[PDB]
Design a protein around this ligand. Sequence first.
Ligand SMILES: O=C1[C@@H](c2cccc(Cl)c2)CCN1c1cncc2ccccc12
Ligand SMILES: O=C1[C@@H](c2cccc(Cl)c2)CCN1c1cncc2ccccc12
Ligand SMILES: [Cl-]
Lengths: 302, 298
Amino acid sequence: SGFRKMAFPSGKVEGCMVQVTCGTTTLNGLWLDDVVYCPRHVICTSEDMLNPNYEDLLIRKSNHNFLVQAGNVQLRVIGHSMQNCVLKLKVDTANPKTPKYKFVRIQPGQTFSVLACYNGSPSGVYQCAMRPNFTIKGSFLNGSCGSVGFNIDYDCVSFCYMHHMELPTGVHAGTDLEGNFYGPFVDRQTAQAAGTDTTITVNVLAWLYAAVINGDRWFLNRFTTTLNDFNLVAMKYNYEPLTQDHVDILGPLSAQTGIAVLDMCASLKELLQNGMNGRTILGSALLEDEFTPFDVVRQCSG
Amino acid sequence: SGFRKMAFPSGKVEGCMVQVTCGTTTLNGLWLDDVVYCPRHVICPNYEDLLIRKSNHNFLVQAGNVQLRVIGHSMQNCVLKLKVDTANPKTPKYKFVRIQPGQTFSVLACYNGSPSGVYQCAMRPNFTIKGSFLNGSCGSVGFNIDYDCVSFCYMHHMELPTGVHAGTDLEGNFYGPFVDRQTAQAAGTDTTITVNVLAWLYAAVINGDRWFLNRFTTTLNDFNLVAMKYNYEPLTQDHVDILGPLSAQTGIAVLDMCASLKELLQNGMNGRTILGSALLEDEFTPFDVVRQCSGVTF
Ligand SMILES: O=C1[C@@H](c2cccc(Cl)c2)CCN1c1cncc2ccccc12
Ligand SMILES: O=C1[C@@H](c2cccc(Cl)c2)CCN1c1cncc2ccccc12
Ligand SMILES: [Cl-]
């Protein structure tokens, strides 16, 4: 019993965190085999950040300009290449602590763990979700660039995020490990704004099923809804449309609890209309949207 | 910017998790040097009598895909200490510390000696933890990290009928009035950790959330009368002193933040949130707020 925002154990990622210094800029890098991945903006000064030409700035650098530090050991950079917004620094040592890993690009609503680092040292681990507006509501200070987001399903680490920047609203933007940004963001100081954020409907429903599995039923009602009528209501509360894919994904939880997806959708409609009335669901007075259907099953069943 | 429930990096503890199988019971053990610590209920009660009937070979200890050989066994309170032939090469610098209610720690939830998740907890004033544990999680540990030292403060033993959890420090002494047997046990009435709520209100101010601030101040006496009324823990002069640095950083005196908390408790939030929460969060200590809002690393 119990339901917590749970992160993956960070050990396999901690052994990969290194410090990357280039000129005055110091951020984090991800050391996997003989390559250190880091945000390409490490080659910039804050003076050439409005409109940086990364191809031009990179060509002017040599391997010895990049100082890579793994613990108290300096790694020697033997090559450098840029892949989208990520810099790949080839080093002369393969990381002995390199776990089994994949680079995966996630979709909005997907969750992952963040190992927040400063100066190549891990300071904390938290859980978060890729927002529908492609930002993440992280906890990052200056120096956290290059901190990574991951999932540790089975013995393989799936790297899905690398932190690049904080937007004016205090939210965060970054890329997958291939350097492709999530969202319409660019690694420039140009005026950029997070799009209007919306609630991840499928995740709220998954969390409502988690509450039912944990014995909480107060919010359930005798009603059902059509998928269209649910989306017409949900859209009015800035909730993401629920697709047939989401309904299909919620199938196992629907089978385990005996509550049809469209029946849980009617509970959600009611909750949106009424609020909680001083009650909580899994110790929360708000509808939680950072647990996917896969997170709920994993945490509640194994 | 941002404020998240953040746990310590679990790596130093992951290298210590092993599986302990005794008869039909399989749970987790904490392998430090040549000793594996685990809940004594793995032998299940008259624990002295049950333990004397066991031999070293009855305890199957598994560290990854390697079986450790048990060369001795002793009991310290509600923890079983299985002496093994191999010292854990991954043993970090560690201490066993007993925490006080309100203090926070990270929990590395494990099943079959394998870490599945890490989450941040607080030792409730009623000595329970609101964890997330399934059958097989016994022996999962709670810890803090201080520089490069792991302070082990909790080992999970059981779940109470309300879904909350009970366990011991690493010396086998239970937190709370709980015993490790199948009997009627209930978590006492819980209260809110006042000093932690205030710390989280300072974190919200540091993050630009000021709507709840007011011009008023209060006395520690007047505030504690309100705290008693709303099932909030008394705020001591020690708590006020601990909140000193946050008070200095934000310019909001502790008793000035207390008057904000007093208005929040009598009037509510009114459809507003603080750090994306409609409830007053009490699982961030004043130290957690300072560590996160300043970026301390391990
Ligand atoms: O936004 C950035 C980075 C940057 C700047 C412009 C463009 C690019 Cl791609 C990258 C520089 C550091 N940084 C931060 C990242 N996360 C948290 C922070 C908190 C407070 C201040 C800064 C923070
Ligand atoms: O409470 C216990 C343990 C127990 C039983 C009797 C007496 C003692 Cl001292 C301890 C055995 C497993 N267990 C659980 C521990 N945590 C979470 C759980 C969730 C769901 C089911 C069981 C769970
Ligand atoms: Cl995805």
